Design a protein around this ligand. Structure first.
Ligand SMILES: Nc1ncnc2c1ncn2[C@@H]1O[C@H](COP(=O)(O)OP(=O)(O)OP(O)(O)=S)[C@@H](O)[C@H]1O
Ligand SMILES: Nc1ncnc2c1ncn2[C@@H]1O[C@H](COP(=O)(O)OP(=O)(O)O)[C@@H](O)[C@H]1O
Ligand SMILES: O=C(NOCCO)c1ccc2cncn2c1Nc1ccc(I)cc1F
Ligand SMILES: [Mg+2]
Ligand SMILES: [Zn+2]
Ligand SMILES: [Zn+2]
Lengths: 289, 229, 350, 229
């Protein structure tokens, strides 16, 4: 389908519907009329010098070679009418942030399949491209009705990460405590973010504030100076509790790596379990099988 | 021509020289033509800076005179230097009042201008009041008293409670009451009253004078907080 | 590294750099210009890197209805609303405030705020021509031709002579001093909200409007921090204070604008993360680096910038003192650009 | 008698009036009395400040002269006023140079004082070099070339390179090379040579000599960081 897509132009697209509101960007379901396909078009409005913009579009062309069953497919990245357009594969299941609100909580056996997808997603990006995601969170893990679980909004363009760091302000954070203090430990920060994401959906609440709202500054200060969040005792299996604990060790070196997590008791069990994820997702959302 | 004289005085003001400026503005007033709003502030700045330099000289020389506390020719010489700079101080203030009461006060169409020149007159009589100690004190003290009372009547009549000039008069007349007459009770009453009325029309503050208005306001508050201690 | 002092009788307007009252006679360091009193000399140390009471110093329904605002082209979105170039007895700037559903309690407070903003008239302030309630909320301000300061300093990166650079900083302090004189917190001062009208007059916009930022839930207005943080004071970042938006919070934001104009770069140009800046600044760990400035900036001028960026808000000066200091060296600017000479020796003693 | 006139000169210095101190020290050196450290130091302060104030005023007048040339004969009166400043700038500097020929140079029994007076001569020829243009400048600058060249030799042979008078000599001669002759590479080397030598011989100074030396070398670092860029 990607070979049917030549050069992407603004007038070749037709608006269908908005996928959801964002902090910095907006995403629309669009029809590429020359190809006749439904893409997810993200538009980012950055007030940057053209030299930086041209470099951003240059470093996004790296996504053409990020092809795997745990990475959201990519069609093209171009600039028009003062907005950066990133055209990617449409995921009809939305983000796990949207699925979380619709589910209330996500079952442990479902989160087992998500963990495997995120780990293998982060492994692909770091082995084949050696790029740290630096944004792992439920809103950036996309799912479709086919049962695919794919990572998106990873840092392939270092110039794009610096650009939006100057522009916007977040209310919810999944940044590792060592990154907040200016210490870089490769993909150990992405593993922290995954563990925090896994606690959020399983509990059905936010990990940073535990009953057992806070401003962005109070959230970051808590992540750095307080013990990490943990799953409630009794209601989750000891393997799943141990998995997220190894993912949320504040010490980035003592924190489990991608190779260590792949062979964890929770992952080895979940990899063996037969879970109709596609059936559960469409059931949760209200779609048909 | 007048414009060559006011540009010369303005240029000399930019060079931080207050001898050619004062001479130029005396030469302007000697023509006996009525000034604008602009040409007046230059004259006040010139004859404020010239006395101000001698005032600072008088204060530090008088402090050294009260510092020495011996018995030698240093005290006699410092007294000779005090009476020298005091006589220089007297010559400047007499040149001002000679230039003021002969060309400007008797020919003053604008009542606002009358409050301005009577405020200056009371200021320079207070400048002569603080230095001359004896029988001649009681003449210039009563002269400044009449001048400020005359200015205070026209301020209370036909001025704004938020105008720079009425606030300046209230400020100079309050420090006159504190320093010269040493009745801080009526100075406290006066400054508090002037500060209260100054609050009423706080909304009525146009761009023409926000800096001056708030500057005399905070100076009034600083003088109050000094005197209520 | 030692302050040599001189007896100097200031002839212009100057404020002591501990007590910050009107200074007449006292001392001046011949290195920087950190002028100060003789009275409060025994309370303040050196910082480079019964008395005569003062006298007179020297003298130098606003709702627009429907069918009137021709909403034109979409210009750009902000932190509380989007701008369109509208026509209304000439070109105006419309702003559809992000708050579209205000409660009869928030709506009342907005109408009260507009009351004060409509009673503002300064050469360095954008005119506030009311708002509109029929088509939701839409602040209508004077339309600016030319371009923003942010656009001229980080887009085209056209640096201007220090004379023109200082002038922009002077006119900003002039407009900002007027707002604080009328007791109006800007809450948003940044190069994005400063325009150069036909390339000369500085116009400060998007000031006040505290009630249309931080959406209410009934009768409250907890300022939920949002927008941009490069200009936010550390006290403003924390939001732990009942109110973080004071004059000093605005003075800090001003100090960041000084940094922008002075160095041509936005503060912290070595971090690829926003959350890192929010945390470290609010914690008093990150400060705008003062080692990227030009190799001709006088200590007196540069020091002003350092005073506005004080982590504790109570240490920062107020605009009457800032504007005096900015102006002070604008006059000694050309003479001091020339090479240094042999100074007068110690001639001091305490 | 002498101590009374030195007391008057100190009292004039504290009182900020400098023309009285200039006259009060000129009349003392007019006699030919043995001039000690403090006695020549007050003279150096007096004749520094008095010419310095008029020099800054000329700098402002010359800058305002060249603000707009696309204008009327408002510049005409300015550059004749600049000549008025020059009329009260050159002759007062001549009042100092004739003085060096009267008493200072012949009545010197210590090389250090000879370096000091030759530095002052070269510095006052350096101030006259700025306003004087045409063939006069050539005549003016040639007098300083031999003045600093007859002081550096003694500075090198009789005083340490850490001596504040030798530091001030290298500093003034460095700014002479930069501003007048416009050979900034020779100015940069000279300074670097002066500064490296100062660092090469340090921590040998007196207790009093821990403020003036540091201030000169600190200004030397300021010139060097200014002149690299
Ligand atoms: N009064 C105005 N006149 C002309 N242009 C304007 C005006 N106000 C805003 N703009 C333009 O609109 C664009 C962005 O609009 P804004 O919403 O003001 O952005 P912003 O300043 O980041 O938002 P806030 O609310 O001040 S944080 C800028 O590029 C300006 O050129
Ligand atoms: N391919 C996609 N399919 C469906 N929804 C998407 C897709 N890409 C982005 N979105 C939605 O777009 C919204 C904006 O995302 P973004 O601006 O990156 O910030 P955030 O993920 O933090 O909300 C999100 O709510 C997300 O669910
Ligand atoms: O998406 C991002 N941030 O969230 C939007 C807030 O404005 C984002 C952030 C960093 C980044 C570096 N290189 C691309 N980057 C992004 N985009 C993006 C990445 C991968 C895919 I597949 C699709 C995308 F759109
Ligand atoms: Mg996202
Ligand atoms: Zn003080
Ligand atoms: Zn200093």
């Amino acid at each position: 389908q990607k070979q049917k897509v030549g050069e992407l132009k603004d007038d070749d697209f037709e608006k269908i519907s908005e996928l959801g509101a964002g902090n910095g960007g907006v995403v629309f379901k669009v029809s590429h009329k020359p190809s006749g396909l439904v893409m997810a078009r993200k538009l980012i409005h950055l007030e940057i010098k053209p030299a930086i913009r041209n470099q951003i579009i240059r470093e996004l062309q790296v996504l053409h070679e990020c092809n795997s069953p745990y990475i959201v497919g990519f069609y093209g990245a171009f600039y028009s009418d003062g907005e950066i357009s990133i055209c990617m594969e449409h995921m009809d299941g939305g983000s796990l942030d949207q699925v979380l609100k619709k589910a209330g909580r996500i079952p442990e056996q479902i989160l087992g399949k998500v963990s495997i997808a995120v780990i293998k997603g982060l492994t692909y990006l770091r082995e084949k491209h050696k790029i740290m995601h630096r944004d792992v969170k439920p809103s950036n893990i996309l799912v479709n009705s086919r049962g695919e679980i794919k990572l998106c909004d990873f840092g392939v363009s270092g110039q794009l990460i610096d650009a939006m760091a100057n522009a916007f302000v977040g209310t919810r954070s999944y940044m590792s405590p060592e990154r907040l203090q200016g210490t870089h430990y490769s993909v150990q920060s992405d593993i922290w973010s995954m563990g925090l994401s896994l606690v959020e959906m399983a509990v059905g609440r936010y990990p940073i504030p535990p009953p057992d709202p806070m401003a962005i500054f109070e959230l970051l200060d808590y992540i750095v100076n307080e013990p990490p969040p943990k799953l409630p005792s009794g209601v989750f299996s000891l393997e799943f509790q141990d998995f997220v604990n190894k993912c949320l060790i504040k010490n980035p070196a003592e924190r489990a790596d991608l190779k260590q997590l792949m062979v964890h008791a929770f992952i080895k069990r979940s990899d063996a379990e037969e879970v109709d994820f596609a059936g559960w997702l469409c059931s949760t959302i209200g779609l048909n099988q | 021509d007048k414009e060559e004289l006011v540009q010369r005085a303005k240029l000399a003001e930019q060079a931080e020289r207050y001898d050619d400026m004062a001479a130029a503005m005396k030469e302007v007033t000697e023509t006996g033509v009525e000034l604008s709003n602009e040409e007046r502030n230059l004259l006040s700045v010139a004859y404020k800076n010239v006395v101000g330099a001698r005032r600072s000289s008088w204060r530090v020389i008088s402090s050294i005179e009260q510092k020495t506390e011996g018995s030698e020719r240093k005290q006699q010489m410092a007294k000779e230097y005090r009476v020298k700079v005091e006589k220089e101080l007297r010559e400047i203030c007499y040149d001002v009042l000679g230039l003021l009461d002969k060309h400007l006060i008797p020919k003053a169409s604008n009542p606002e201008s009358k409050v301005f020149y009577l405020k200056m007159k009371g200021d320079y009589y207070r400048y002569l009041a603080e230095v001359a100690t004896g029988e001649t004190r009681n003449s210039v003290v009563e002269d400044s008293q009449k001048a400020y009372q005359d200015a205070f009547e026209i301020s209370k009549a036909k001025m704004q409670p938020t105008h720079p000039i009425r606030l300046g008069l209230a400020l100079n007349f309050s420090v006159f009451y504190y320093e010269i007459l040493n009745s801080p009770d009526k100075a406290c009453q006066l400054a508090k009253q002037a500060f209260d009325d100054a609050i009423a029309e706080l909304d009525t503050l146009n761009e023409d004078s926000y800096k001056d208005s708030t500057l005399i306001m905070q100076l009034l508050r600083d003088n109050l907080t000094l005197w209520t201690s | 590294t030692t302050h040599n002092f001189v007896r100097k009788t200031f002839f212009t307007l100057a404020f002591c750099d501990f007590c910050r009252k009107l200074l007449f006679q006292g001392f001046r360091c011949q290195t920087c210009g950190y002028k100060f009193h003789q009275r409060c000399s025994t309370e303040v140390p050196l910082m480079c890197v019964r008395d005569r009471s003062s006298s007179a110093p020297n003298v130098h329904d606003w709702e627009i209805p429907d069918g009137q605002i021709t909403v034109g082209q979409r210009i750009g979105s902000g932190s509380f609303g989007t701008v369109y170039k509208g026509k209304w007895h000439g070109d105006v700037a419309v702003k559809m405030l992000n708050v579209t559903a205000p409660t009869p309690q928030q709506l009342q407070a907005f109408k009260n705020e507009v009351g004060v903003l409509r009673k503002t008239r300064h050469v360095n302030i954008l005119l506030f021509m009311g708002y509109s309630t029929k088509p939701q909320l839409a602040i209508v301000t004077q339309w600016c031709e030319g371009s923003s300061l942010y656009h001229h300093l980080h887009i085209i990166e056209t640096k201007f002579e220090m004379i023109k650079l200082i002038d922009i900083a002077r006119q900003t302090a002039q407009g900002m001093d007027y707002l604080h004189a009328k007791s109006i917190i800007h809450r948003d001062l940044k190069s994005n909200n400063i325009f150069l009208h036909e390339d000369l007059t500085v116009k400060i916009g998007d000031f006040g409007l505290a009630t249309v930022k931080s959406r209410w839930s009934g009768s409250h207005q907890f300022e939920q921090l949002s927008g941009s943080i490069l200009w936010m004071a550390p006290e403003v970042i924390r939001m732990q204070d009942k109110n973080p938006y004071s004059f000093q919070s605005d003075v800090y934001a001003f100090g960041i604008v000084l940094y922008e104009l002075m160095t041509g770069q936005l503060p912290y140009s070595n971090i690829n993360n926003r959350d890192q800046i929010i945390f470290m600044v609010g914690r008093g760990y990150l400060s705008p680096d003062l080692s990227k400035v030009r190799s001709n900036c006088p200590k007196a001028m540069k020091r002003l910038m350092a005073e506005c960026l004080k982590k504790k808000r109570d240490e920062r000066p107020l605009f009457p003192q800032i504007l005096a200091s900015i102006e002070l060296l604008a006059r000694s600017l050309p003479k001091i650009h020339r090479s240094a000479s042999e100074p007068s020796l110690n001639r001091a003693g305490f």
